[PDB]
Amino acid sequence: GAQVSTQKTGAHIIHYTNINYYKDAASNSATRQDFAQDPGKFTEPVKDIMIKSLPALN
Amino acid sequence: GAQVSTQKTGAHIIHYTNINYYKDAASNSATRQDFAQDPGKFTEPVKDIMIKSLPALN
Amino acid sequence: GAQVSTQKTGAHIIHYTNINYYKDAASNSATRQDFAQDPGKFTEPVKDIMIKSLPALN
Amino acid sequence: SITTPEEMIEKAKGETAYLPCKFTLSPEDQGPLDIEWLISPADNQKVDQVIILYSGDKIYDDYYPDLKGRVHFTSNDLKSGDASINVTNLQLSDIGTYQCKVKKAPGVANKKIHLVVLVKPSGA
Amino acid sequence: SITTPEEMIEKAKGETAYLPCKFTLSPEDQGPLDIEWLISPADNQKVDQVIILYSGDKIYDDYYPDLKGRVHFTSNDLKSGDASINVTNLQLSDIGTYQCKVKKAPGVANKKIHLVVLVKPSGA
Amino acid sequence: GLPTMNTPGSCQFLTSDDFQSPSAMPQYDVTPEMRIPGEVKNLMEIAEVDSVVPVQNVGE
Amino acid sequence: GLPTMNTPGSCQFLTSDDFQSPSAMPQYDVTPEMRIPGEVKNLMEIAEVDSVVPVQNVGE
Amino acid sequence: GLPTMNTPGSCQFLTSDDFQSPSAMPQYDVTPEMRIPGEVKNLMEIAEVDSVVPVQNVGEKVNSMEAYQIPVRSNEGSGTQVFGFPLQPGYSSVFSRTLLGEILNYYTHWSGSIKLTFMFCGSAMATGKFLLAYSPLGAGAPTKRVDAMLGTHVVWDVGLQSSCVLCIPWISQTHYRYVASDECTAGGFITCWYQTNIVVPADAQSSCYIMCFVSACNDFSVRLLKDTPFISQENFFQ
Amino acid sequence: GRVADTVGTGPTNSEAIPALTAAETGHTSQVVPGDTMQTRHVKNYHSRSESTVENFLCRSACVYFTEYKNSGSKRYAEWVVTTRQAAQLRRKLEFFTYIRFDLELTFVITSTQQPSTTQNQDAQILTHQIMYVPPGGPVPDKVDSYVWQTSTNPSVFWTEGNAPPRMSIPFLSIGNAYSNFYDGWSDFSRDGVYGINTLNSMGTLYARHVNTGGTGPIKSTIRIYFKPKHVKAWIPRPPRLCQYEKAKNVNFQPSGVTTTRQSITAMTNT
Amino acid sequence: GRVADTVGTGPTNSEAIPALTAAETGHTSQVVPGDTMQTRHVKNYHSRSESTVENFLCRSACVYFTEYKNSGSKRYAEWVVTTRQAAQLRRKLEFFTYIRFDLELTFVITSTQQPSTTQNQDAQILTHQIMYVPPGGPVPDKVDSYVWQTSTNPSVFWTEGNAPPRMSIPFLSIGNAYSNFYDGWSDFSRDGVYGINTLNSMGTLYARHVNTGGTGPIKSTIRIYFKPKHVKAWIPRPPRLCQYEKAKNVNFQPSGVTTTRQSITAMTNT
Amino acid sequence: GRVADTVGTGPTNSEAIPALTAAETGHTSQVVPGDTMQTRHVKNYHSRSESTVENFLCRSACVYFTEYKNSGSKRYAEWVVTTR
Amino acid sequence: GYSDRVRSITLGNSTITTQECANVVVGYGVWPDYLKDNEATAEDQPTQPDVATCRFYTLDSVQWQKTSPGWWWKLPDALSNLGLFGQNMQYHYLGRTGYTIHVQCNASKFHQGCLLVVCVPEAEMGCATLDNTPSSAELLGGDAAKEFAGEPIASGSNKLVQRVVYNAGMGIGVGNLTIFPHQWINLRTNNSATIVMPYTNSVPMDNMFRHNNVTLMVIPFVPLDYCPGSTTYVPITVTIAPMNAEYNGLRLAGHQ
Amino acid sequence: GYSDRVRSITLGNSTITTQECANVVVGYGVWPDYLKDNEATAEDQPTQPDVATCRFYTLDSVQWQKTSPGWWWKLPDALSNLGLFGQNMQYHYLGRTGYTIHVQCNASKFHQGCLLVVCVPEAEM
DSSP, rough: OEEEEEEOOOOOOOEEEEEEOOGGGSSOOOOOOOOOOGGGGGGOOOOSSSOTTSSSSS | OEEEOOOBBOOOOOEEOOOSSBBGGGGGGOOOOOOOOGGGTTTTOOOOOOTSOOOOOO | OEEEEEOOOOOOOEEEEOOOOBBGGGGGOOOOOOOOOGGOOOOOOOSSSSTSSSSSSS | OOOEEEEEEEETTTOEEEOBBBOOOOTTSSSOOOEEEEEEESSSSSEEEEEEEEEEEEOOSOGGGGGGEEEOOOSSSSTBBBEEEEEEEEEEEOOEEEEEEEEEETTEEEEEEEEEEESSSSOO | OBSEEEEEEEEEETEEEEEBBBOOOHHHHHOOEEEEEEEEEESSOOSEEEEEEEEEEEEOOOOGGGGTTTTEEEEEEEGBBOOEEESOOOOGGOOOEEEEEEEEETEEEEEEEEEEEESSSSSO | OEOOOOTTTTTOHHHHHHHHOSSTTTOOOOOOOOOSSSOBBHHHHHHHHTOOOOOOOOOO | OOOEETTTTTTTTTOOOOOOOBSTTTTTTOOOOOOOBBBBOOOOHHHHHHHOOOOOBBBO | EEEEEETTTTTETTTTTTOOOSSTTTOOOOOOOOOOBBOOOOHHHHHHEEEOOOOOOOOGGGSSSSGGGGGEEEEESOOOOOEEESSTTTTTTTTTTSHHHHHHEEEEEEEEEEEEEEEEEEEEEEEEEEEEEOOOOSOOOSSSSSTTTSSEEEEOOSSSSSSSEEEEEEEEEEOOOEESSOOOGGOOOEEEEEOOOOOOTTTTTTTEEEEEEEEEOOTOOEEEEOSSSSSOOOOOOO | OOOOBBBBBBOEEESTTTTEOOOGGGGOOOOGGGTTTOOOOOOOOOOOOGGBBBHHHHSSSSEEEEEEESSSSSSSEEEOSSSTSHHHHHHTTTTEEEEEEEEEEEEEEEEEOOOOOOOOOOOOOOOEEEEEOTTTSOOOSSSSOOOGGGGGSSSEETTTTOOOOEEOOOOOSSSSSEOOOBOOSSTTTOOOOOTSSSTTTOOOOEEEEOOOOOOSSSSEEEEEEEEEEEEEEEEEEOBSSSSSOOSSSOOOOOOOOOOOOTTTOOOOOO | OBBBOOBBBBBSSSSOOTTOOOGGGOOOOOOOOTTOOOOOOBBOOOOOOOGGGHHHOOOOOOEEEEEESSSSSOEEEEEEOTTTTSSHHHHTTEEEEEEEEEEEEEEEEEEEEOOOOHHHOOOOOOEEEEEEOOOOOOOOOSOOGGGGGGGSSOOOEEESSOOOEEEEOOOSSSSSSESOOOSSSOOOOOSSHHHHHHHHTTOOEEEEEEOOOOSSSSEEEEEEEHHHEEEEEEEEEOOOOOOOOOSSSSSOOOSSSOOBBTTTTOOOOO | OOOHHHHHOOOSSSOOOOTTOOOGOOOOOOGGGGGGGOOOOOOOOOOOOGHHHHHHHHHOOOOOOOOOSSSSSSSSSOOOOOOO | OOTTOEEEEEETTTTEEEEEOOOOOOOOOOOOOOOOGGGGGOOOBOOOOTTSSSSOOEEOOOOOOOTTEEEEEEEHTTTTTSSHHHHHHHEEEEEEEEEEEEEOOOEEEEETEEEEEEEEESSOBBBTTTTTTHHHHHOSSSOOOEESSSSSSOSSSSSSBOOBGGGTTTOGGGGGGGSEEEEEETTTSSSSEEEEEEEOOOOOOTTTBOOOOEEEEEEEEEEOOOOSSSSOOOOOEEEEEEEEEEEEOOOOOOOO | OOTTTTTEEEETEEEEEEOOOOOOOOOOSSSOOOOOGOOOOSSSOOOOOSSSSSOOOOOOOOOTTOOOOOOOOHHHHHTTSHHHHHHHHHSOOOOOOOOOOOOOOOOOOOOOOOOOOOSSSSOOO
């Protein structure tokens, strides 16, 4: 039950193979390819949306 | 996800297998079978093509 | 890209597996199962065929 | 490293020599800064003698009785890249080779200045 | 290696012997060239004594008081493959076995010449 | 035995390695995850937040 | 790491072994083969050729 | 554990090995590639470019521009020799420091044809004709024009087209020849002779110079990488 | 990858002049033997695979080595990473003006017991630490420093007797290629050291003994091997003629363009 | 691969004379037992697989060994690569006039401490370097030479206790086959050494200690093993009768064609 | 995982005031260079993969070390497990 | 009719003609062009002046004597004081350009001599004093040509360039300079050389005062000769036109 | 472009070039060729060496002085000691050949003079 996944490469795709050997998830290798982001909870945590081209206070 | 490729052999075809083990491209093995060539940028870098059977200057 | 081939066995068939690991043919293992023969170039190198039941010279 | 590591300077007795030692740091150089000036006199057979030191945020004079009070740093801010020194009231008995050593690990650099002092003030 | 590594040469007193030592290099031989000639005399019990050397672009004579000024290289260009020598004004006291040693790493070769000098000039 | 050949790098400990390894605690059942506010996925999410500059950093 | 176990025979050099090995000369291009007369595939091909017997092998 | 058995070669470091290995810098994002002019894929692309031959490499002339100049002049006869050297493109001091030669000295074997281009650099009023000749080995180098004429050769007539090409074709008993000096793989001889004279009017210089260039033909190749004998070192630089 | 065949040609008498050209134009002639002589037809099978830029550059070379002891003054080694201290690899790289590559690093570490008067020496086995400090990172000033903690610096630990340690490094430049040559300055006033940039800055390597072994003195040596991989290169150059003098500049002593022979018709070297 | 069966035959009375021939013609008779006697039918299953040229040649053999020390005069070993210094493999190869093969090289390196007066010996583990210099490459003249930098020469590094080091070499000739015999010269005047060509030139091997170990003296020995692989061979020859004398020529001392017995009817050897 | 491109903008004369805001609100402004100057268009390929929380934290570090002897007083080591 | 010896080249308000030319060498096969969106890194809108700066500038002439070793010019710097190309260099952090280079030298059918004309990317030169590196005044001629020497420059404790011609100031063999883009001016064939050079660098744009990325070199391989009664003064004259010039990072003028 | 003043002629392993030529004269309109079956009389199979003998041989040069009357060369004989053409002449009773003759003489735009170059069948003197 092998899994094939893409390697990290440069810009101007090539693949690699993995097979889990052990019975616990905590034995697996690291999770290095999680590139999701969500900065809007720290920037812009305001109740009323603030449209950038308008005055902030009116 | 194995890749099969041809070995270097003599003239007067036989194959080999590879599987990438690591998560970065920089971990892969060397690229030894790139046999493209393009000498016309160093030889013949002239604006006007020069037909070999003609005089070069007329 | 595995190759399966027959093993050497006795007379009165069982198989084995191989996979090439390297990029040059000179890295492969020996060629031990080439059983062709052709002794007629050393025995009988005569221009006129010699039929065994006849006299050699007539 | 130091800008011009090999040079020679000619001055006259009574004048005061500027010995330039200007350096530039690499991004790898992250250790503490050390600056040493030593001397090898021409007349004398003593060799490789410290005349002025700078380390751990402060200066140390008083290493060469001969240059007592006549060797100083010329910059108000040494660690910005200037380790030049002034020698004053020059006389013949100091003609020699001065050496500037700058250390900031991993980087190490040195510079040799050959000071010639002449009788008459004249570059011929 | 050297062309004919074992030979014997007969000459008469007063004549001058040619000792051929001609060699050929292999493509592997890329070290510097060394050429040595040594001697084992018949009359005498001294053995393996250098008479003439060539190394590092130059010749060295003056190793055997007996052959002083009477042993020379015959080629204007030695490193092209010629290490032959001339001995001159031959007399009985030099009859012996001469040895030619050519070195150019990895390669090493030697040649033995047995020089016989006879009273009368005659090959019988 | 499958015929093998150890390459250079065998038995080294490289601190940025990413290998599997046996767990010392077989079949242990981790505490379930909770929905906690303010989850961070990327350090740049922090960098994009404003903070106050000490411009007048002179003496005392 | 795939869990493995070395068997007896590990790290021996047996002179009649048949193993792959890395070439010291990557991608070298061998001289092409020529058709040469008298190719030999098997030593028995030699044995089937007649040769002269020294029957009178007595003294000098 | 999967039962395994280590073969000979285990744990060696062979400098021409080609194995994977773990990166010390996981997920680092390389700078994107740029379109830069002059990309090189193969060293032969360099070998096929002409470069200037130091034919007159005699004495102190190697410390000046005169090493690249071939003297010719108006003679009081004809058929005398202009130059000669052997076809030893990696080992002859004539050829060893050209582009072709410098590449060859990283290799053990060479094969293929070679081009020698000559450019006459006298005044426009000077005329002349030259014989350029290659003589395969086995009989030694020619000493007269009438012996050089028997081999492969070109008769160059100097005019509006200023340059002439002698092709040295691959004529060998072996598919390859050694870069080092070796008599079993001797290459032969290259010579140049006055076919007629150099003739000038009055008030034009009667001495002139030719220049020579070398490059590889499209049939040329090299084998078996090695270290060059040209670079060396006694301590690590600083 | 193959080389070109030879077309067979017969005799000729015409206005076509393939062998006459004008080198003034900067063009290299494309002549083949069939242009100037009768030739047979040849089926050439020779290949050009051993002279690709990758195969030309992809071999391990020792760029540097140093020593450190288990006692005394010099307890660790320190090296700014560069290709310009070893002649053989520098010369090969400087065939090209600009180049991209990844690296495979291999370390060859060996130890030797030093003469002493200490009796009853029963040393245990030695482990070694090699730390790589990127540029800007703090550096150790003693063998027992918190820096060797290596929270974010990659380190390899290695015990003597095992296979040599090895790791890969990606193309690491802030520029789009490494530059082997730089005709300029880093300071905008051009009053500084000439030829210095930071497009090739790669960092520093530190090496130490983790344990001291036994009561006797021991000196170790670390040799560093670079193998380039995945190579791209641009703008070929004349190969270096004069011997190298300095690691940080191109300074040379003048030398003749080749070695000499006796005369212009001489068939041998001198 | 099997051998031929035996056809059963009965009595005969005819003009057919299979057993009478003429050896003058150069032909070897194809007679089988059924031609000259009554035979049963036999189903033969025997095979000829162990006498293929490959199986006959493909075993490891020691071609050469030498020694080097950690101190003193001879600090490294140097060997021009050849098959002609060890009798057993030379003789097997010289069954054939021309032959192509690849090689597998195995090295067996072992060390021994030498007698001394030095007290307190606590030697560390020894690593070894083996360098292969193709023909034409520069060679080391001392154990500490820049040549050991090996930018382009293949080298193997190996630590004692591990498995023996091994590498493959392709067919390496400039000719289309290696020649075991050469009836001629290298110089066109035939005034040189006879029997010398460069179709078998293979290069040189150098071996050294990387570290010295400890304070005591240590001598090591390197044994070199050749195994041919992927063999093709042509033009069989009579096997070598006389003992070998030199490595670079075929020179021999004459000897009888076999050993003797007492009389022409004697049933035992002498 | 990629970073954002740069939109090319030309001159402007209007009531839109992207560069004036009120930091009192706790909001961080979302301004980009095109709001306050003329810019070309840029195709940015840079990635943010090396600053994920995982890649930021997943390296080996020595948290503690100690010693023990084969004879004498301290024959074993003992450590309460912690990162602090 | 037609002849491939004549040529005209027009740029901006300038035009050059020639009646005895060879051909035109184009770089490494690459014609110059503006930087594209998918290779840019600087975000501001670039200025493209386009006839004010892309035009022929003629430099000061130079005398070919019978013993002349040769000349060189670093390219951004040679034009740095010259017109609006110079002004735009002075007011911007970043710049990008190619070039059309044209070298002129006429003489009679009775003179003889041969010059190599080469355009060398990244011509980092050596100092006579092995520990030092050469000063700016030694390397940068600044609209005046710099001269090679005939013999090695003596070592002192100076900052002079190691100037000897047969190593091209670069520790190489000068006959191998033909790997670079080049032509020959051979007095019996040709009175002009023309090279079109694209932008070359390891980065998309660069500062024009800090870094000189190409160097023109002109070197006599066959010396000038003639007979008495012929004209003795033979000058060489260089004209250079930048192509596709762009600038980024506007600020106050200067270089420090 | 093109010019009818340039010419190249290749035969065997030899080639000749010229940049100031006139044209090429062909015999009496007849190009050389081997003898045909219906004109042969000798019955044995002929040898045809074909590059070993069909190639350019350059003779010894000659000085043009202001008073030179002129020169002549008998053709089989001029080449009779010269290469494998000479050897094949020496070993055979019978032979048959044509020729390509090329005469070279350069001088400056300031010299003047005029030579006739003729090929005379059966020049009995």
